[PDB]
Amino acid sequence: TMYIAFILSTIFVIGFVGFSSKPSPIYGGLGLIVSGGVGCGIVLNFGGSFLGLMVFLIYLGGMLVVFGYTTAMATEMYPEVWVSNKTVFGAFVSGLMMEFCMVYYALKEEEVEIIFKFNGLGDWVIYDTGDSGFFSEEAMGIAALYSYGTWLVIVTGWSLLIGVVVIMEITRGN
Amino acid sequence: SMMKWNRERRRLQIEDFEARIALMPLFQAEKDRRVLQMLRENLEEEAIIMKDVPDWKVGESVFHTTRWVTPMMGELYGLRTNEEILSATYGFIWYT
Amino acid sequence: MNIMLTLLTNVTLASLLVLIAFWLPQLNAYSEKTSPYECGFDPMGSARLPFSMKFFLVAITFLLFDLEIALLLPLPWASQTNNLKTMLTMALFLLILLAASLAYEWTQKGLEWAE
Amino acid sequence: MPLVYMNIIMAFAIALAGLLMYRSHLMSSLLCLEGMMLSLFIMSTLIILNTHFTLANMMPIILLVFAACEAALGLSLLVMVSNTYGTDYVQNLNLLQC
Amino acid sequence: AGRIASFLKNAWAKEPVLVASFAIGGLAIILPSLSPYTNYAIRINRATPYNYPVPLRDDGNMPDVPSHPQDPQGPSLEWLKNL
Amino acid sequence: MNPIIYTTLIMTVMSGTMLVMISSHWLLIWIGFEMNLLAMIPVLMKNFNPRATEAATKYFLTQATASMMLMMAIIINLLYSGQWTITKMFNPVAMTMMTMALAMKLGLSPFHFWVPEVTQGISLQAGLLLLTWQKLAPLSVLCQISQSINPNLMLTMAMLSILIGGWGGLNQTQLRKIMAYSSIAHMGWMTAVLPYNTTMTILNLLIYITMTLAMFMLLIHSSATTTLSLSHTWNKMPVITSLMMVTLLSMGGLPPLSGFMPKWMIIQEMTKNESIIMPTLMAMTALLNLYFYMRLAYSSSLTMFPSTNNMKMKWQFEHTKQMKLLPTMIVLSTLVLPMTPALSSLN
Amino acid sequence: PFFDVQKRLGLDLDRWMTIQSAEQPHKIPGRCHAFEKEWIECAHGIGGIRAEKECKIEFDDFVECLLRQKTMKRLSAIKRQRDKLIKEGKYTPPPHHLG
Amino acid sequence: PGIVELPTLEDLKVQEVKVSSSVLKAAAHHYGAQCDKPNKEFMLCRWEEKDPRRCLEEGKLVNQCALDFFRQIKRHCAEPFTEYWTCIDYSGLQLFRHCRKQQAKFDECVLDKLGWVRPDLGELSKVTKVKTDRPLPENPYHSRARPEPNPEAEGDLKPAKHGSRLFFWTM
Numbered sequence A: 001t002m003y004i005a006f007i008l009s010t011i012f013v014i015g016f017v018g019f020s021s022k023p024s025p026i027y028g029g030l031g032l033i034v035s036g037g038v039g040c041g042i043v044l045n046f047g048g049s050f051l052g053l054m055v056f057l058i059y060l061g062g063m064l065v066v067f068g069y070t071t072a073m074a075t076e077m078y079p080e081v082w083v084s085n086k087t088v089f090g091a092f093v094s095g096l097m098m099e100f101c102m103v104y105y106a107l108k109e110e111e112v113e114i115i116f117k118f119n120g121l122g123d124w125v126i127y128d129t130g131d132s133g134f135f136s137e138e139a140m141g142i143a144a145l146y147s148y149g150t151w152l153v154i155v156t157g158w159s160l161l162i163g164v165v166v167i168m169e170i171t172r173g174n
Numbered sequence B: 001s002m003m004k005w006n007r008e009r010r011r012l013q014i015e016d017f018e019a020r021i022a023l024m025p026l027f028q029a030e031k032d033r034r035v036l037q038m039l040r041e042n043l044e045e046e047a048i049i050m051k052d053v054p055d056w057k058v059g060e061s062v063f064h065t066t067r068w069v070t071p072m073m074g075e076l077y078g079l080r081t082n083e084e085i086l087s088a089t090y091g092f093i094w095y096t
Numbered sequence C: 001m002n003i004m005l006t007l008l009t010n011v012t013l014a015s016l017l018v019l020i021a022f023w024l025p026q027l028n029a030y031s032e033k034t035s036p037y038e039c040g041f042d043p044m045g046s047a048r049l050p051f052s053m054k055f056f057l058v059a060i061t062f063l064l065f066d067l068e069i070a071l072l073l074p075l076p077w078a079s080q081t082n083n084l085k086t087m088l089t090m091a092l093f094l095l096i097l098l099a100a101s102l103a104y105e106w107t108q109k110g111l112e113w114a115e
Numbered sequence D: 001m002p003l004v005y006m007n008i009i010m011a012f013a014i015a016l017a018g019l020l021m022y023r024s025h026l027m028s029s030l031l032c033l034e035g036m037m038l039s040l041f042i043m044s045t046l047i048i049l050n051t052h053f054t055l056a057n058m059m060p061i062i063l064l065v066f067a068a069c070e071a072a073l074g075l076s077l078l079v080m081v082s083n084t085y086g087t088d089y090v091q092n093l094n095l096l097q098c
Numbered sequence E: 001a002g003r004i005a006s007f008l009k010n011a012w013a014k015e016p017v018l019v020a021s022f023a024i025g026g027l028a029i030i031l032p033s034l035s036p037y038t039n040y041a042i043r044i045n046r047a048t049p050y051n052y053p054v055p056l057r058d059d060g061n062m063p064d065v066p067s068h069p070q071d072p073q074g075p076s077l078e079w080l081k082n083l
Numbered sequence F: 001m002n003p004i005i006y007t008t009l010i011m012t013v014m015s016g017t018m019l020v021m022i023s024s025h026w027l028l029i030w031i032g033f034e035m036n037l038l039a040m041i042p043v044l045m046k047n048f049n050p051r052a053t054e055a056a057t058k059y060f061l062t063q064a065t066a067s068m069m070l071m072m073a074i075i076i077n078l079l080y081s082g083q084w085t086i087t088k089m090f091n092p093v094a095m096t097m098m099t100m101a102l103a104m105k106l107g108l109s110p111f112h113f114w115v116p117e118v119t120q121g122i123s124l125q126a127g128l129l130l131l132t133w134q135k136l137a138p139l140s141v142l143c144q145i146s147q148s149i150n151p152n153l154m155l156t157m158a159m160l161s162i163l164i165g166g167w168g169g170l171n172q173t174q175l176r177k178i179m180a181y182s183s184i185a186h187m188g189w190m191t192a193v194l195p196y197n198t199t200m201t202i203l204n205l206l207i208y209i210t211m212t213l214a215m216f217m218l219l220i221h222s223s224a225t226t227t228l229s230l231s232h233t234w235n236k237m238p239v240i241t242s243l244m245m246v247t248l249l250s251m252g253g254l255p256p257l258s259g260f261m262p263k264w265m266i267i268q269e270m271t272k273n274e275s276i277i278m279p280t281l282m283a284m285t286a287l288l289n290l291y292f293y294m295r296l297a298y299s300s301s302l303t304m305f306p307s308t309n310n311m312k313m314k315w316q317f318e319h320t321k322q323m324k325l326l327p328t329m330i331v332l333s334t335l336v337l338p339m340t341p342a343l344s345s346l347n
Numbered sequence G: 001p002f003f004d005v006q007k008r009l010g011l012d013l014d015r016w017m018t019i020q021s022a023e024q025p026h027k028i029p030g031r032c033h034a035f036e037k038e039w040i041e042c043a044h045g046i047g048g049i050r051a052e053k054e055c056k057i058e059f060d061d062f063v064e065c066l067l068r069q070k071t072m073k074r075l076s077a078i079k080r081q082r083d084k085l086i087k088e089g090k091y092t093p094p095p096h097h098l099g
Numbered sequence H: 001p002g003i004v005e006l007p008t009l010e011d012l013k014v015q016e017v018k019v020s021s022s023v024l025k026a027a028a029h030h031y032g033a034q035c036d037k038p039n040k041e042f043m044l045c046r047w048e049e050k051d052p053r054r055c056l057e058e059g060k061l062v063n064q065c066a067l068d069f070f071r072q073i074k075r076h077c078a079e080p081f082t083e084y085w086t087c088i089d090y091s092g093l094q095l096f097r098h099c100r101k102q103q104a105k106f107d108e109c110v111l112d113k114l115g116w117v118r119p120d121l122g123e124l125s126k127v128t129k130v131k132t133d134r135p136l137p138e139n140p141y142h143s144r145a146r147p148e149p150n151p152e153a154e155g156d157l158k159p160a161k162h163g164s165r166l167f168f169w170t171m
């Protein structure tokens, strides 16, 4: 129970290795949604309740769902399987071992310098000490989209309407 | 009816918030002493732990500024039991 | 964490029900028994039957509507601001743009299951 | 930096490598793009929650919606390519060499 | 006159759902700008005390800041009690 | 497409570019790039052939990958500074990520492969938009963050762009691929002086956009996309081919034409910084671009290729539409060298 | 911005989310509000070139606040040196540190 | 660099107010009414100084004022207060609205036996002023001196001497 965010992050990276080794896209999507679930859990452990539930509802139940639906239509006659290629196994194995080596090095050394400097002193350590009062600071920051973020709403809504128009232009096929 | 009821629910929330406001100086005064005591206890312990580390100097602020800096969880609970620091980190988040 | 225990229990009991469900019966299987069901005959595999642009278009339009819904979810807390006229203007703006996307898809064929 | 950040940035690097190293299917590359976006979302969320940058709490929402719009566009492109060639194989997208 | 009435007739006869939806959306657009109560909602949101009301030091010449919570100075919620 | 929908998509492309150029916030800059790409993809697929679809797909893949890398650079910068303002980057690897992302968006040499294929696969109007308007946003970002770029990385990419644009364009008979390789070389010229003087980058961009607009409008006026099709244009409208020849000479940077101004100013500004070998290399390498420009001029105006019998039909017909601002673009692309000191207005 | 339309038209299009010391909802403070404020008040109006050297202390304190790297190093040293003396049976953590 | 200076453990000792959240909430309105002076004075110190270590004795006075407030409750109707805070303690949100009968006979105690009127809605949320003796902190941020600004532009614009001077150009 002492370490929860680290198992979650290691599983996150494992799922990333799994779907980025690119088996047939249905198993890649399964790995992506496993990664998304554990990442939603990660941000739940950081106090990002609304953001993680957004991950769930819109990413895993929306965007993914649509991805798997579209894969179920444009696939191979025998939709492929993970095992069918030695390349998938090699990529997944290399990614898993580079995960294991670096997490072991960071755990037992705490001063790795792979591009960035890292210290696995813990993950609870960086949390600050204070009271947030009678509201969720995350929800207040996100609800400010309609009061502070007028410009953001304007450009995002315009881009979504343009996205509808754009999709209907491209898919017409003439 | 919903107008009547939601209007009443807003005054009740104001009353609750004012109860909290009245209680806040007590809680702030208590939290200050608690935090300072934890920091000073860590200091007294590290004066012992770090006796033999050669160039170590105990109490040395990581910051250039001498202004008060609110400690992180690591400075507060880094020398206490796993259950206590687990509570101080995730007790609210996990409470359901 | 209570919720984690609850999820563990639900998943564990569902998998246990699988294990009893999928191992307890007495089995005797031959080739023609497990043949794919096609109302008394054999099915044709053909070649990638699940097609037609309309199934993909409804998925894409649901995706974009779901994104705007993601933009609408913070609304219960948005009504708690002192600057209520700006917030109301922006929420209604987002909803008009949702209605405009629906109307544009509607008028330009869009939502139709054509011939 | 804490080791969660290490693993999140590592996930982004793995998604980038998986996208740059192609295979036959286009959908696999699009899923790698989606993984890159998801790692960006989590990194942004961790940074924003940790430093209590309250107004920046909305930034991950915007990132998610815009990247999903791009994903819809890419899915439509894949569907057009498949309707041309019956598959989403990138090796059929080579007739611009001449 | 008859043209708009006839259009509304045809819409009510063939697409009542769209008529109801457009009327509801139009009222949702229009009615808030005429309500005396919208300002009241703004005031209620303003009168909700989320934060601590950290005090001030009376340097003299502060005759409108109360001193005590129950002094006849500072804003009053008597209006909200009857609304 | 619907004329209203096409106008809206064009306006959305320009508004994404403007969002990039008017924002102080990195998230809004990323939003502008996203909006530009979203609106740009349909204009590439306007004709809708498998070539157009493949061009759009390759464009989308490169631009989306670049955008994700740019967002990662922004997030690393925020991780180390907490800053959203577009200013110097506070992290070196974030700066490297951002530089690579912006170069991939621009199509610089190590990320140049998409430019020739996409330009060939789309129509001349789409290519005109692609090679003129799409350079503004990444270059403006680069000019804003120029004080923190690694000069070695940028100069490497610019020199490679010049070399590859020179060499790749040598082998082309397709006018769109020739335009794309010329664009790669000119982007290299723009980005070489970027570490030293962003005003020179703006000047070179304006001159290049003028020349590219003139050349693409002449091609659209000619309806020619191959060198042999252009070789018939003398027997229809020789004025167009002579104007095209002077424009190609300008593109080669031959004095006293307008295309010589950016090279001359950039060489001067570079020698001001003890940079002598690189300007000499760049000027020498541009002779390749001038070589295939001169090949096009030979086939188009300076000599007369065989025509066809069916060309007599086209003689009795005028153009239904007329290219806007083409005479102005031609004069600006050839005759503006005496006005060089006006470049200080860009300061 | 390349074209500072906001400062010409007086509009606040995106400057409100640009720093964590800007005005926040319900006046919720940023975690590094004082550090950012001090660095910004040091670096104001002297240009980035001067601000990079002459405001180095404020930016260093800000970066330490954001990513507590040196704080984490010191805590890690205290932790691992504590264990370095648990094994030998040297240091007994006191009752208020064990329960 | 530098030593973080810390108070000792006995600089931090105080008579604790050891009553629970429901007991605290039940008396909260009369507590705000009766204990405003040291509470607002300590909150002034905390926001003015941005330092827990600078306001310890004010917090120590906060504690004493709370303690004496509760000892005044205890000697007149500890029993109605006990019933009221018990009823408040039952509900999982510690709601006031479920305990109005008990709040009623707690409130008509302190009037008759102690004089304590209960603050009205909004009074406890007011920003008040405190007449403190503590000097106003001069540099609460412990700020360094700010850098000297670049010299401003003075003088009138004259035309460029010999023009642009760009190569061969004379204007």
Ligand SMILES: CCCCCCCCCCCCCCCCCC(=O)OC[C@H](COP(=O)(O)OCCN)OC(=O)CCCCCCCCCCCCCCCCC
Pocket (backbone or CB within 6 Å): F238, F239, F240, F242, F243, F245, F246, F256, F257, F301, F302, F334, F335, F336, F337, F338
């Ligand atoms: C020194 C630098 C510049 C050098 C180049 C100058 C101009 C060169 C023009 C082309 C020269 C090469 C071709 C020579 C063969 C003859 C011309 C040709 O190719 O076609 C001839 C044809 C004639 O057309 P015509 O029959 O008159 O049409 C009547 C209506 N049916 O069509 C024509 O005659 C068309 C002619 C077009 C001319 C275009 C001019 C563009 C602008 C020139 C700028 C010059 C700058 C000089 C230096 C300035 C420095 C600041």
